[PDB]
């Protein structure tokens, strides 16, 4: 009718083996046996069992502390003859057992412009760890792929990463990176989950054209119609950021020549001095427009 305490408590590890002997429970004055009450939680009941006879309490099943980290079990002393309750306060630890996970709504495909400025966020991502304290905060790094160090991860609320512009980006050096992206808990030791944030870099009308002959041209024609000079310049960006304009912007006042805007090839109009001083502008067709002069000398 009297138990060897006012109440039992006990401290056990999640995952502790199947079978452990956790507490005692000890009634006396008739044969004594121990059982839950009707009341314990089917959950608690799971978990643990008592021994009739010993008053005994084992670990029964796998306990889990990400699915509850404290039981109360009320224990019935029968001896035979309402019989006395005493209450059992189990607490449950934590281990180290889960890694972080990524949420989907993590970026793992963008598109930066390569004039993104430095600290200009271009992604997030979000990981979550249920275990707890240390156990369970995140913090981010980007393990590989990040050349020439690009970009920056930087960690909030044990749970965000924010991708930022680092260094200057430049399309014409590198136009993609691979960035693996990895979430770290903060156990000792710690547990690790990676995820590929894929990035392409795009284009900016940065590169002037470039003329082929860095001194210009120095021609002589004896012809209507007759082809003088291919004026060739290249530009270092892509699509409409390297497709070339050509003009004769001066010194074809008697209307002499013609220059083809695509080709760049400079002609004798079907149709007087000895001597012409062309000066040629090309144009990209990017945005701003950029362009590069030459000088075309015709002697006739
Ligand atoms: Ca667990
Ligand atoms: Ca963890
Ligand atoms: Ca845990
Ligand atoms: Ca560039
Ligand atoms: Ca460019
Ligand atoms: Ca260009």
Same mark, same amino acid.
């Given at each position: 009718?009297?138990?060897? $305490?006012?109440? !039992?408590?006990?401290?056990?590890?999640? $995952? /502790?083996?199947?079978?452990?002997?956790?507490?005692?429970?000890?009634?006396?004055? $008739?044969?004594?046996?121990?059982?839950?009450?009707?009341?314990? #939680?089917?959950?608690?009941?799971?978990?643990?069992?008592?021994?009739?006879?010993?008053?005994?309490?084992?670990?029964?099943?796998?306990?889990?502390?990400?699915?509850?980290?404290?039981?109360?079990?009320?224990?019935?002393?029968?001896?035979?003859?309402?019989?006395?309750?005493?209450?059992? !306060?189990?607490?449950? /630890?934590?281990?180290?057992?889960?890694? &972080?996970?990524?949420?989907?709504?993590?970026?793992?495909?963008?598109?930066? &412009?390569?004039?993104?400025?430095?600290?200009?966020?271009?992604?997030?991502?979000?990981?979550?760890?249920?275990?707890?304290?240390?156990?369970?905060?995140?913090?981010?790094?980007?393990?590989?792929?990040?050349?020439?160090?690009?970009?920056?991860?930087?960690?909030?609320?044990?749970?965000?990463?924010?991708?930022? @512009?680092?260094?200057?980006?430049?399309?014409?050096?590198?136009?993609?990176?691979?960035?693996?992206?990895?979430?770290?808990?903060?156990?000792? &030791?710690?547990?690790?989950? *990676?995820?590929?944030?894929?990035?392409?870099?795009?284009?900016? $009308?940065?590169? &002037?054209?470039?003329?082929? #002959?860095?001194?210009?041209?120095?021609?002589?024609?004896?012809?209507?119609?007759?082809?003088?000079?291919?004026?060739?310049?290249? *530009?270092? *960006?892509?699509?409409?950021?390297?497709?070339?304009?050509?003009?004769?912007?001066?010194?074809?006042?008697? %209307?002499?020549?013609? %220059?083809?805007?695509? #080709?760049?090839?400079?002609?004798?109009?079907?149709?007087?001095?000895?001597?012409?001083?062309?000066?040629?502008?090309?144009?990209?067709?990017?945005?701003?427009?950029?362009?590069?002069?030459?000088? @075309?000398?015709?002697?006739?």
């Amino acid at each position: 009718v009297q138990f060897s $305490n006012a109440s !039992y408590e006990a401290v056990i590890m999640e $995952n /502790l083996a199947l079978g452990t002997e956790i507490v005692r429970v000890q009634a006396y004055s $008739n044969q004594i046996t121990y059982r839950f009450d009707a009341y314990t #939680s089917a959950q608690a009941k799971a978990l643990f069992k008592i021994d009739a006879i010993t008053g005994v309490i084992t670990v029964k099943g796998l306990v889990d502390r990400e699915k509850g980290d404290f039981y109360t079990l009320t224990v019935v002393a029968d001896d035979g003859g309402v019989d006395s309750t005493v209450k059992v !306060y189990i607490t449950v /630890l934590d281990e180290n057992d889960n890694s &972080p996970r990524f949420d989907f709504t993590s970026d793992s495909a963008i598109s930066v &412009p390569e004039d993104c400025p430095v600290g200009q966020r271009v992604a997030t991502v979000k990981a979550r760890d249920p275990d707890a304290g240390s156990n369970g905060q995140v913090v981010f790094s980007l393990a590989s792929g990040n050349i020439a160090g690009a970009f920056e991860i930087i960690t909030s609320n044990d749970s965000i990463g924010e991708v930022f @512009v680092a260094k200057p980006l430049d399309r014409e050096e590198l136009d993609h990176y691979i960035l693996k992206v990895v979430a770290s808990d903060r156990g000792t &030791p710690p547990r690790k989950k *990676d995820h590929i944030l894929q990035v392409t870099i795009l284009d900016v $009308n940065d590169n &002037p054209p470039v003329i082929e #002959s860095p001194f210009g041209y120095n021609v002589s024609v004896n012809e209507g119609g007759t082809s003088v000079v291919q004026v060739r310049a290249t *530009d270092r *960006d892509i699509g409409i950021n390297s497709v070339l304009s050509y003009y004769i912007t001066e010194g074809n006042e008697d %209307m002499t020549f013609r %220059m083809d805007r695509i #080709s760049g090839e400079i002609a004798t109009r079907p149709a007087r001095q000895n001597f012409y001083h062309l000066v040629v502008t090309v144009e990209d067709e990017g945005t701003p427009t950029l362009s590069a002069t030459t000088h @075309v000398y015709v002697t006739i």
